[PDB]
Amino acid sequence: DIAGLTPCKDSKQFAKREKQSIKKLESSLKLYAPDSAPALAINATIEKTKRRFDNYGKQGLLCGADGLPHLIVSGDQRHWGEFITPGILFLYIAGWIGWVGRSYLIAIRDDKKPTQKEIIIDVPLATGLVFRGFSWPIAAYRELLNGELVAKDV
Amino acid sequence: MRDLKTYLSVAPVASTLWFAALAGLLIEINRFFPDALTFPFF
Amino acid sequence: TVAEPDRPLWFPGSTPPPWLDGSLPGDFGFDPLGLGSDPESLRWNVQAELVHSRWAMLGAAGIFIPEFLTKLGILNTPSWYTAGEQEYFTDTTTLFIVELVFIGWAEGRRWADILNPGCVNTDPIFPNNKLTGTDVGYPGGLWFDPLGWGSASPQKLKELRTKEIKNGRLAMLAVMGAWFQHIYTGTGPIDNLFAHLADPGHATIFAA
Amino acid sequence: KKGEWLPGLASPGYLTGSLPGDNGFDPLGLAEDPENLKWFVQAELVNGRWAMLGVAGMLLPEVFTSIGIINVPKWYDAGKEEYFASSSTLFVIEFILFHYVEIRRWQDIKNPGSVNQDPIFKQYSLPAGEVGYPGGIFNPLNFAPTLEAKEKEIANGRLAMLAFLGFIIQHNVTGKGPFDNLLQHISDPWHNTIVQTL
Numbered sequence: 001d002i003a004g005l006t007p008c009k010d011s012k013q014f015a016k017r018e019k020q021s022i023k024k025l026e027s028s029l030k031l032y033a034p035d036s037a038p039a040l041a042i043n044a045t046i047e048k049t050k051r052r053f054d055n056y057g058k059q060g061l062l063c064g065a066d067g068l069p070h071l072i073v074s075g076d077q078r079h080w081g082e083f084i085t086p087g088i089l090f091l092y093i094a095g096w097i098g099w100v101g102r103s104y105l106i107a108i109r110d111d112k113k114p115t116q117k118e119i120i121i122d123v124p125l126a127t128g129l130v131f132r133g134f135s136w137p138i139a140a141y142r143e144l145l146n147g148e149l150v151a152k153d154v
Numbered sequence: 155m156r157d158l159k160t161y162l163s164v165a166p167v168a169s170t171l172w173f174a175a176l177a178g179l180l181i182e183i184n185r186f187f188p189d190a191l192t193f194p195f196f
Numbered sequence: 197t198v199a200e201p202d203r204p205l206w207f208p209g210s211t212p213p214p215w216l217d218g219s220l221p222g223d224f225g226f227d228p229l230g231l232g233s234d235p236e237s238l239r240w241n242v243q244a245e246l247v248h249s250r251w252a253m254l255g256a257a258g259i260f261i262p263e264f265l266t267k268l269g270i271l272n273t274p275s276w277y278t279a280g281e282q283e284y285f286t287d288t289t290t291l292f293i294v295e296l297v298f299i300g301w302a303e304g305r306r307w308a309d310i311l312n313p314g315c316v317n318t319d320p321i322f323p324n325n326k327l328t329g330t331d332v333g334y335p336g337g338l339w340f341d342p343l344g345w346g347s348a349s350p351q352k353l354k355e356l357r358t359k360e361i362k363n364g365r366l367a368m369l370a371v372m373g374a375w376f377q378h379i380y381t382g383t384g385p386i387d388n389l390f391a392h393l394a395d396p397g398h399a400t401i402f403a404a
Numbered sequence: 405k406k407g408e409w410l411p412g413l414a415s416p417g418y419l420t421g422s423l424p425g426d427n428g429f430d431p432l433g434l435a436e437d438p439e440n441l442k443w444f445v446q447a448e449l450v451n452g453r454w455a456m457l458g459v460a461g462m463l464l465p466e467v468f469t470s471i472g473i474i475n476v477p478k479w480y481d482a483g484k485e486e487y488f489a490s491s492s493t494l495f496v497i498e499f500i501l502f503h504y505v506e507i508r509r510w511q512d513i514k515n516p517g518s519v520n521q522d523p524i525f526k527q528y529s530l531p532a533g534e535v536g537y538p539g540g541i542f543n544p545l546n547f548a549p550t551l552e553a554k555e556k557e558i559a560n561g562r563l564a565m566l567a568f569l570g571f572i573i574q575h576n577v578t579g580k581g582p583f584d585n586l587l588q589h590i591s592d593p594w595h596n597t598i599v600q601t602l
């Protein structure tokens with residue numbers, strides 16, 4: 001397949017890794033009471049490990065010669081879940097954060113003692129401002145088009 | 155009360171409460187959807 | 197405000213805080229931590245105590261009478277504590293979410309007036325209905341004052357509001373006590389009352 | 405009394421009820437700028453008209469087919485049915501036709517009245533209306549573009565937009581069209597909601 005990698009569900013090294021992982025935990029479960037707190041905790045993580053391997057298999061990840069799920073970021077549409085849709089989500093959240101911060105800075109820039117509102121947050125103003133980040137992309141686009149995102153005069 | 159509200163909004167305390175809330179949120183999210191290497195919904 | 201200078205205090209002999217001049221219904225000068233030294237915060241907390249006491253009076257009724265009336269064999273209400281999961285015609289989520297929108301709109305109306313007194317009084321469909329009350333927390337209206345029992349000159353009404361708030365403080369403590377009693381023991385409140393009255397010297401919290 | 409989305413909250417300063425459908429609803433401060441507002445009123449109108457047409461064509465055929473008059477596919481399937489032409493052919497046709505019409509509309513948004521006249525026949529222009537509601541030939545029955553009439557269009561358009569949101573989310577989590585959803589709910593309501601769906 002892409003870059004010579006093979007679908008983990010059909011790979012052999014990916015399975016071997018899963019069985020080996022599951023094997024060692026089972027050993028930790030032994031030498032204790034069969035239904036003890038520690039034993040119950042070990043069981044829980046065994047089931048968790050089995051779920052993680054099956055989830056990896058289901059999502060169609062690519063496995064190399066070591067059986068480790070490699071991530072493709074070239075833009076192939078069979079793999080947007082690996083980098084590009086999480087990337088769009090990140091860009092959204094980071095723009096939210098930055099836009100809210102910038103909005104706040106602009107709003108408090110007009111007092112006489114603006115540093116007072118920086119070492120001691122005006123939380124009412126901040127809570128009024130936080131939710132504009134939800135629409136930050138449209139606001140920023142229209143601010144760029146308006147020409148008011150970038151300060152002229154500098 | 156007013157002054158307690160002020161002090162509770164000083165930068166270090168505001169930021170520790172913010173980051174504790176953020177940590178709680180991320181911890182719970184990964185407690186419900188653990189071992190996530192991708193976005194598998196759409 | 198009638199600044200009762202010599203009202204009976206919770207701690208006799210000690211001066212009440214300055215922001216508590218007896219203006220509020222049932223003011224006994226109790227604010228050691230000074231949680232209400234701000235006029236806006238004072239107002240907000242007056243609203244909070246009132247709504248808490250009303251909810252808690254409704255809850256104290258709905259806990260203590262059904263089990264005092266099913267202890268005696270009148271009907272068969274289950275234990276108020278585990279009364280949450282005994283299934284009904286639907287699931288808890290459908291009823292909770294349906295009720296949340298229902299309860300939510302009324303709460304929003306209260307917020308609209310708590311933060312802006314007398315700006316939501318009238319009805320959105322038939323604008324001729326006009327909830328009566330002129331004080332925040334005391335909305336009146338045909339809906340909340342059909343009997344008009346306390347629309348008289350501000351004398352009896354002031355002693356009527358104190359009555360409400362005192363019953364309400366008692367109810368808040370009552371409801372919390374039933375929850376604490378139900379967590380510590382494993383019985384019902386009427387059961388605890390009957391036991392402590394059967395053997396007062398020995399059947400108390402110092403029984404574990 | 406310009407309408408209030410939240411009875412206890414005052415309305416923003418940039419909104420002054422001049423525009424039809426103004427209920428003081430802009431919590432996120434999206435139109436604090438006049439030019440932003442002027443662009444957004446056009447955006448809302450065109451989105452709402454498209455949504456009206458869209459959920460009309462999405463829902464009305466469904467009840468028409470489910471009461472046994474026509475036999476149309478589901479909207480989430482009708483694209484797969486093959487028609488007299490390839491799908492890509494239809495797509496590029498629509499692309500070229502839409503590109504010319506949208507460009508025209510854009511040129512009038514940017515400079516009102518600059519594209520009123522027919523570019524082929526130099527007679528047959530448009531009467532000087534106002535941006536967003538282009539009268540003339542786009543108004544054959546010649547109804548009165550009254551303010552209350554404009555408000556009705558804005559009110560309906562917003563309802564259609566919410567209806568479309570509902571249609572797509574409903575189909576994504578349920579697995580079927582809108583009318584099947586409604587009849588299957590009102591069949592037994594207390595056990596057919598989102599709670600049971602999720």
Ligand code: CLA
Binds near residue numbers: 074077091137141
């Ligand atoms: C370093 C070289 C390079 C670069 C730059 C790219 C770039 C790209 N490749 Mg490619 N690729 C490469 C090398 C490269 N590739 C190589 C060497 C191979 C062979 C292994 C491939 C094989 C390959 C395949 C097989 C495919 C791609 C695809 C793609 C595209 C996927 C992303 C997309 O569709 O657009 C962007 C996606 C979006 C959803 C757009 C949303 C982004 C928004 C608009 C920006 C967000 C900003 C913010 C949140 C909001 C705006 C704010 C602002 C207004 C202020 C993309 C443009 C895919 C493709 O063809 O694309 C369709 C695909 O099929 N590539």
Ligand code: CLA
Binds near residue numbers: 097126130
């Ligand atoms: C309003 C918050 C804010 C915003 C919008 C930006 C925006 C930007 N920063 Mg910056 N930065 C910030 C805060 C912010 N920064 C703080 C607090 C620091 C001190 C650590 C820095 C240190 C910094 C450096 C050293 C550099 C930038 C750079 C940049 C530019 C490139 C993006 C980047 O790499 O950032 C990087 C982001 C960081 C290094 C850390 C960000 C800190 C947090 C995430 C933001 C704080 C938000 C605020 C506390 C929330 C208050 C909201 C209110 C409601 C209370 C970009 C325009 C780079 C640049 O010059 O571009 C060419 C660059 O080299 N920033």
Ligand code: CLA
Binds near residue numbers: 367370376381400
């Ligand atoms: C609202 C008033 C009220 C009343 C009338 C009662 C009555 C009773 N409680 Mg109870 N309780 C209350 C509140 C109340 N409680 C509150 C708020 C809590 C949470 C701390 C508790 C927690 C509690 C526990 C854990 C237990 C009881 C128990 C009991 C029974 C025996 C008393 C005892 O031994 O424990 C002492 C109870 C307390 C020290 C809490 C009382 C403190 C508040 C402030 C009430 C003060 C009374 C008030 C000032 C005067 C009442 C006015 C009027 C009705 C006379 C008894 C019938 C015991 C029982 O089950 O009997 C076997 C028991 O196990 N209560």
Ligand SMILES: CC(/C=C/C=C(C)/C=C/[C@@]12O[C@]1(C)C[C@@H](O)CC2(C)C)=C\C=C\C=C(C)\C=C\C=C(C)\C=C\[C@@]12O[C@]1(C)C[C@@H](O)CC2(C)C
Binds near residue numbers: 229
């Ligand atoms: C509201 C409430 C309870 C509501 C419960 C309801 C509605 C339950 C309804 C039910 O449906 C359930 C769910 C189950 C159903 O089967 C039955 C019922 C029962 C019908 C309790 C509040 C209970 C609230 C309580 C007890 C609060 C106590 C606060 C105190 C003591 C503070 C005092 C001070 O703050 C001052 C005033 C000044 C400061 O300076 C100093 C200090 C000391 C801090």
Ligand SMILES: CC(/C=C/C=C(C)/C=C/[C@@]12O[C@]1(C)C[C@@H](O)CC2(C)C)=C\C=C\C=C(C)\C=C\C=C(C)\C=C\[C@@]12O[C@]1(C)C[C@@H](O)CC2(C)C
Binds near residue numbers: 431457
């Ligand atoms: C255009 C549209 C849909 C168009 C659909 C079409 C053409 C369907 C076409 C077809 O069906 C046919 C006919 C036949 C089928 O066989 C095939 C398809 C192809 C299926 C929906 C828009 C849908 C648009 C939607 C849902 C918009 C939602 C906007 C919201 C909620 C914004 C609210 C706020 O913005 C305010 C108002 C104020 C801000 O301050 C705060 C917030 C909260 C942000």
Ligand SMILES: CC1=C[C@H](O)CC(C)(C)[C@H]1/C=C/C(C)=C/C=C/C(C)=C/C=C/C=C(C)/C=C/C=C(C)/C=C/C1=C(C)C[C@H](O)CC1(C)C
Binds near residue numbers: 260366371373389
């Ligand atoms: C703790 C404990 C323990 C032990 O063991 C046991 C016991 C004994 C049980 C306990 C105790 C308890 C208690 C104390 C309780 C109390 C309560 C209360 C106070 C209530 C009130 C309660 C009160 C109440 C309800 C009241 C109510 C009122 C009302 C409805 C009114 C109404 C109305 C109005 C508005 C208006 C109009 O015009 C008139 C009318 C229509 C008429």
